[PDB]
């Protein structure tokens, strides 16, 4: 009949929906999804630095120098660490690595290590070095071996274990991570055989640290065919500090140690996911995110720059309007 002008709004083919406080499942013409739920199930280089693959070895296994862990021996630099859920090679001679959790925390933080001989075997006088071996700690080539960073010191043929002393002065600019031990025989028999007779001790100290232990002798349930135990210990020798070592007997001495470079967050992932020649900006413990989104489905645990973690399945914001296309029929 007559000229029309009408006011109205865009519709479209979109079938994407959003919720509001008042209504669910509203189809809108335009929206943006703010939450990411896709990942690549792998470990990539962060800041172009490859992570450290422990492989069969555990963290204990790695830094004490389990003989089977020679693949890892010496210098390492990493953006993060990956320890496999079923690594076999850890502490092979049964005992406690004391303050272990606090050690795992320290290593995570945790950029690079340089291996080096801290106390040469000759440091200790009047004692036998060459007999510190066990069948509880084979290498892949000898049935009886021992940690590459410790010395199991035995009394010599004369049935006296002299007092031994060792000094190391840290003139470097880097903290040094180092390890030592105290042996606890199942027998007084084995005690007499391996070391002297009479009360034994292991004392150590620095400008800020003191340590004193004596052997606690007792028969214990067999582990790796050993009813005896070793107490392992760790510490960090700050720049400009000096270590003094002194033992009557039962010392498992430091031999090799680590110059330790701090970082600069750091992480330790327990996981069986593959490690590959790839780069990432965001690495979760269950995968790489490669995304623009603001929120992440995948994991609360990550190193690098990740979206914020939430339990949501979806976080889609309406940008367009309610979509009311015409029924075409």
């Amino acid at each position: 009949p007559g000229d029309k002008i009408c006011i109205g709004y865009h519709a479209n083919n979109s079938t994407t929906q959003v919720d509001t406080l008042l209504e669910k499942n509203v189809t809108v013409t335009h929206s943006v999804e703010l939450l990411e739920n896709q990942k690549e199930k792998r470990f990539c280089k962060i800041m172009n630095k490859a992570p450290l693959d422990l492989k069969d070895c555990t963290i204990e296994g790695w830094i004490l120098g389990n003989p089977k862990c020679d693949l890892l021996l010496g210098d390492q630099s990493w953006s993060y660490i990956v320890e496999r859920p079923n690594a076999q090679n850890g502490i092979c001679y049964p005992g406690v690595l004391n303050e272990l959790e606090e050690l795992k925390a320290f290593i995570g933080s945790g950029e690079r290590v340089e291996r080096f001989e801290m106390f040469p075997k000759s440091t200790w006088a009047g004692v036998d070095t060459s007999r510190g071996v066990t069948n509880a700690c084979p290498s892949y080539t000898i049935d009886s071996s021992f940690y590459r960073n410790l010395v199991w010191i035995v009394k010599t043929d004369s049935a006296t274990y002299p007092v031994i002393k060792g000094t190391y002065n840290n003139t470097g600019t880097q903290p040094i991570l180092y390890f030592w031990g105290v042996h606890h025989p199942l027998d007084t028999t084995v005690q007499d055989n391996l070391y002297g007779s009479g009360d034994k001790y292991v004392r150590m100290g620095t400008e800020s640290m003191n340590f004193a232990k004596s052997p606690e002798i007792a028969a214990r349930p067999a582990v790796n065919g050993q009813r005896s135990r070793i107490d392992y210990y760790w510490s960090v020798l700050r720049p400009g500090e000096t270590l003094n070592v002194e033992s009557n007997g039962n010392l498992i001495a430091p031999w090799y140690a680590y110059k330790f470079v701090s970082t600069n967050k750091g992480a330790v992932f327990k996981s069986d996911l593959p490690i590959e020649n790839c780069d990432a900006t965001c690495q979760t413990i269950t995968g790489v995110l490669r995304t623009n989104k603001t929120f992440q489905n995948v994991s609360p645990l990550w190193i690098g720059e990740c979206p914020k973690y939430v339990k949501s399945e979806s976080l889609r914001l309406a940008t367009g309007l309610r979509n009311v296309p015409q029924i075409a029929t």
Partner: protein, 173 residues
């Protein structure tokens, strides 16, 4: 809808209007077609975009969870860590989810207000020169060519110019 326009007194959208959120449909002896109102669409796009960026901006921190181990004399602080991290996870999930529900309600109201505002603008220019047909549609009581159509869309419609013609036609019917 809350302002009553979208899916309200204007029943459906236009798949035909492809260049804008809000628009006019016209029909004249010259022709028929769809045209987005550019000013209001562009204002809405800037506003929606600022809002998305604000939300992204404010959400751009992260709580830090950690891989730390605990020994079996450390049940209490291990659980303290667990309850701490879950605690922040719950607070952030709550915020993102509640925010999206609230902003989604308001963003739809915004579109619904612009449609309504666009309709009230046109209605108040036309006055009695045009007859309301119902679904946001006006039928002119006079010839309205393309220049006159553009005139309405631009906000410069000349009610006096056509008021004699409209009145005479109105009486006739």
């Amino acid at each position: 809808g809350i302002f009553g326009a979208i899916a309200g007194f204007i029943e459906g959208g236009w798949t035909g209007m492809i260049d804008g959120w809000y628009g006019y449909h016209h029909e004249n002896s010259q022709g028929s077609g769809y045209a987005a109102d550019r000013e209001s669409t562009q204002k809405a796009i800037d506003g929606i975009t600022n809002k998305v960026n604000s939300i992204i901006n404010k959400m751009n921190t992260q709580f830090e969870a950690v891989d730390h181990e605990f020994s079996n004399l450390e049940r209490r602080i291990g659980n303290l860590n667990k309850r701490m991290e879950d605690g922040f996870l719950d607070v952030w999930t709550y915020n993102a989810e509640l925010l999206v529900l609230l902003e989604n309600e308001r963003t739809l109201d915004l579109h619904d207000a612009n449609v309504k505002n666009l309709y009230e603008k046109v209605k108040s220019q036309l006055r009695d020169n045009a007859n309301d047909l119902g679904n946001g549609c006006f039928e002119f009581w006079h010839k309205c060519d393309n220049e006159c159509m553009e005139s309405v869309k631009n906000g410069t419609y000349d009610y006096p110019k056509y008021q004699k013609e409209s009145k005479l036609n109105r009486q006739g019917i």
